[PDB]
Nucleic acid binder design. Sequence first.
RNA 1: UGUUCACCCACUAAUAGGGAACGUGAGCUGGGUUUAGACCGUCGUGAGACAGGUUAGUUUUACCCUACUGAUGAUGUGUUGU
RNA 2: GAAUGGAUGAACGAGAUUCCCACUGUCCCUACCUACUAUCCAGCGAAACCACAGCCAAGGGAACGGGCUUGGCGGAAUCAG
RNA 3: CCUCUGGCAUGUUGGAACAAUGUAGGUAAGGGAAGUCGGCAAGCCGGAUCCGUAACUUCGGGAUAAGGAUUGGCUCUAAGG
RNA 4: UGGAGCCGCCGCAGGUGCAGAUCUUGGUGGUAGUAGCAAAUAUUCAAACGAGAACUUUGAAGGCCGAAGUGGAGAAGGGUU
Lengths: 394, 15, 60, 153, 57
Amino acid sequence: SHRKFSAPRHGSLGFLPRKRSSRHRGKVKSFPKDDPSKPVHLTAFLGYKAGMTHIVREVDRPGSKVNKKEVVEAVTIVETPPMVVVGIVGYVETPRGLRTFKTVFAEHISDECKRRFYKNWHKSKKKAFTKYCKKWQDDAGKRQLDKDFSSMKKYCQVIRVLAHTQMRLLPLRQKKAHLMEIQVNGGTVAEKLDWARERLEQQVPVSQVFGQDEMIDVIGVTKGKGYKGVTSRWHTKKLPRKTHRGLRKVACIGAWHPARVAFSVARAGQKGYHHRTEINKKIYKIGQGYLIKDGKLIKNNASTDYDLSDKSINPLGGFVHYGEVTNDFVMLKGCVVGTKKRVLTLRKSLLVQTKRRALEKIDLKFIDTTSKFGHGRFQTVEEKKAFMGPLKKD
Amino acid sequence: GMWRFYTEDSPGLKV
Amino acid sequence: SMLRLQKRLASSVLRCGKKKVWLDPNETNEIANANSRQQIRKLIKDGLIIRKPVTVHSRA
Amino acid sequence: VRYSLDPENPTKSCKSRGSNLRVHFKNTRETAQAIKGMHIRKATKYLKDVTLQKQCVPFRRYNGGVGRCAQAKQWGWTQGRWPKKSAEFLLHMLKNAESNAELKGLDVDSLVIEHIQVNKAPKMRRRTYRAHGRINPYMSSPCHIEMILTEKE
Amino acid sequence: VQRLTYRRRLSYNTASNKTRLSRTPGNRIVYLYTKKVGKAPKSACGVCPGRLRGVRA
RNA sequence: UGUUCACCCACUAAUAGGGAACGUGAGCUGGGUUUAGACCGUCGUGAGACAGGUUAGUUUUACCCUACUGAUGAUGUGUUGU
RNA sequence: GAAUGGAUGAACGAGAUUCCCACUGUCCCUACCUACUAUCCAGCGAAACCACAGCCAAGGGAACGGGCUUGGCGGAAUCAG
RNA sequence: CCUCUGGCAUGUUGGAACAAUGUAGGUAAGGGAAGUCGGCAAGCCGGAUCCGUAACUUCGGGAUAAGGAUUGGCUCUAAGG
RNA sequence: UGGAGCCGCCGCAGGUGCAGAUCUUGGUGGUAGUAGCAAAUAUUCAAACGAGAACUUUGAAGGCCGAAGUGGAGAAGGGUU
Ligand SMILES: [Mg+2]
Ligand SMILES: [Mg+2]
Ligand SMILES: [Mg+2]
Ligand SMILES: [Mg+2]
Ligand SMILES: [Mg+2]
Ligand SMILES: [Mg+2]
Ligand SMILES: [Mg+2]
Ligand SMILES: [Mg+2]
Ligand SMILES: [Mg+2]
Ligand SMILES: [Mg+2]
Ligand SMILES: [Mg+2]
Ligand SMILES: [Mg+2]
Ligand SMILES: [Mg+2]
Ligand SMILES: [Mg+2]
Ligand SMILES: [Mg+2]
Ligand SMILES: [Mg+2]
Ligand SMILES: [Mg+2]
Ligand SMILES: [Mg+2]
Ligand SMILES: [Mg+2]
Ligand SMILES: [Mg+2]
Ligand SMILES: [Mg+2]
Ligand SMILES: [Mg+2]
Ligand SMILES: [Mg+2]
Ligand SMILES: [Mg+2]
Ligand SMILES: [Mg+2]
Ligand SMILES: [Mg+2]
Ligand SMILES: [Mg+2]
Ligand SMILES: [Mg+2]
Ligand SMILES: [Mg+2]
Ligand SMILES: [Mg+2]
Ligand SMILES: [Mg+2]
């Protein structure tokens, strides 16, 4: 018979085999469409979720009940130190698909990077690319290198650049820079490929790729939650108190007769650590990192035109389970998938963004710097110190 | 031999 | 080596628990040739086996 | 006695067995296959590692419910265990053999374990008490073992 | 505190098995079994409720 | 109301109808039917009867195969990694 | 419907109801924590059950098939569920 | 509940982890039975002192009805042989 | 292989041929190295003996039973414990 009292189904099938991701680093599953007209540029970048905080701002959507009212608003910080382009890589279109074609690498590649070509650097003799970089210092090779490029200049349709992170600069424990292919969408294939050839062994910082007040798409792997029961996994109803074998279950699996159980029925398995592609995370700010001229310029980070203090985004006592974000960073509105220290793939949108909300320009009045390791009440040490006075440890 | 049921249980009762 | 005999006998000779019995763990061999009592009585006078004190339980 | 399988050159091969030993046949079997073919000075090292859990034994046949371990990767199998009794039992059987080679006058440290066979021995028996006054059997499943080493260097 | 045991196999409290404490020379409270309390003879006259005098009860 | 059914309140965009061993008891519950105790009424000379009312009344087993969910792996690609 | 007892009735009741107050995770609507388990390992080590076995759709068929027909299709060895 | 006399080695094993399901305990914002057949389960209540106690009643009860108040620590006073 | 008896023909005789009987007795698999060895808070350090110690004994520490006892004694029952 039918179901007496309807309800929607729990979960969405369009996300499943609810399995532990194969990857750790979030793949850009689809870059946006190149055109011609608009200059070459990368389409994406690679970051590290440090943590979160408030922001205060005036808000200018006329019509609202919040119009030119300040609000507080959540943000993530994503520690995003400049990438290095090491290789390029051409893709040819085919009726099968999009076959990879011709991969050049640079002369020099950092150890940061070369780590990733070994499971075990301690043990390894560190011999990768030794016999390759020979090419870059003779005639014969250097000619073949040009032919390898000029082939791509004729044939290949799509050219992405390979880059890697500068793992060095992050507080994180690992030394193995994540590599990545990042797509160059811009002018003709030659022009494209020439731009990449100029960028080889070279830095590419965040600002070059993304701009402020820009909707981007975060991709990254979810915070992982082990095996779980159907209840926390699928958010099916808990059964009632009296229930002789378990109540954090799904009473009936299937009906009798299609007498298998279906993929559509809620079972217990891996919760979290899925691969996920969020979209539309605005960029409330892109901070310049630390640097010097005579003394430090730490001020420039969490400072605003309405605060003008000397704060870093680094809250008191560091970002928790992370460290000091010394480098440049992007400050997305809201949460992003995945956990502290996670390698987080930012990407330009696939989408023509033309909505009131998605074009609003941001002007922050205040970035909250208060400790995250307890109910913090002081923005910065200087302030705390004055408030309390001197102590017994003096 | 294994218990299965009480003699007033008479499992599959369908009076 | 194995002494439960000698902890019993001690106890009944002191007329105490066996909790209260204490055997000098160094001088064990000498104790393990106390297959009788009276043998033990010797060992009590020589100070190998000894009656412990009562575990205090003050009223203060 | 008659061993199963005579060695090709008895002259320079040594023997050792032990009938009706109270070790898990199934654990013993498998580790005895693991051991097979090694140089004796390797196998004594292996079985030491097993006893300490520094190398597993792949459970291949009798592998049901038997968990996974990385250490089994070496072998190229997902199941694996550390059957400490078994090891200790055929660490003796290697010792007796090594001895038998030494008495026959073979270069001990050229031996290779050419044939090693576990076998079901006649079961001991005792019982267990169950619910509703039933009584079930509780059987030890011991194993005859035997093996033949050989000079090969 | 020194508790104690029945000196005889009669485990039950009963009219038989009645006791008292004695300390001893050896200094241990031991149980002694008592005798039953016998009564002085009653009058033959019947009417009188008193038991007789000068008669070891 | 044990109910299916029905009815009524309230909100709603709408409060459409149906199937899957009258989906679904090693998923539950067990309120109802449907043992045994007992109560009433009617029937029966009586033992007893009653799709007439009432109250009390043990809901067993998965460690197999499969199916499903997750999890190791497998064949190839010389070996390995990207 | 009148000792096949009729009508009552304080007190009592692990008795059958109904309602109100308080109370609460019964519920919205689920979460966290503890201990024993399950899990993995060393040692030990049963049982029920078992024609053969073990992916489906439809068909026909003792009128609801794992086996038959016709299609879909099929990839060792396993783990927790 | 904690202890002394006396007795024991955690009840037929150990180790490592701390996932799901369980078994046994807890806690829960706001709401407060909407849950369910049904408040099942748990929760409230609770000890003593001082007040203060209804209908009804076989005048015995109902009654700890109901309903309120107080309680620690310390330093004194007074009263009782 | 084994180590002491056996057969062809003609007649006579029968307790004369097994896949099943939820058949009888015995033995053996799969299940499975699985289910399990989770009621009552608790173990640790050293030393001895010893081929060998998570468990034996000795000492120390931490714990429990907490005099309606996990203490000391008997009845019935056991029958050398
Ligand atoms: Mg419907
Ligand atoms: Mg139940
Ligand atoms: Mg925090
Ligand atoms: Mg299991
Ligand atoms: Mg049992
Ligand atoms: Mg019995
Ligand atoms: Mg007498
Ligand atoms: Mg006289
Ligand atoms: Mg039905
Ligand atoms: Mg079912
Ligand atoms: Mg059932
Ligand atoms: Mg019922
Ligand atoms: Mg009945
Ligand atoms: Mg009548
Ligand atoms: Mg009548
Ligand atoms: Mg069938
Ligand atoms: Mg315990
Ligand atoms: Mg123990
Ligand atoms: Mg016991
Ligand atoms: Mg609440
Ligand atoms: Mg209701
Ligand atoms: Mg309802
Ligand atoms: Mg209750
Ligand atoms: Mg009342
Ligand atoms: Mg003979
Ligand atoms: Mg005959
Ligand atoms: Mg037969
Ligand atoms: Mg197991
Ligand atoms: Mg207690
Ligand atoms: Mg005694
Ligand atoms: Mg006793």
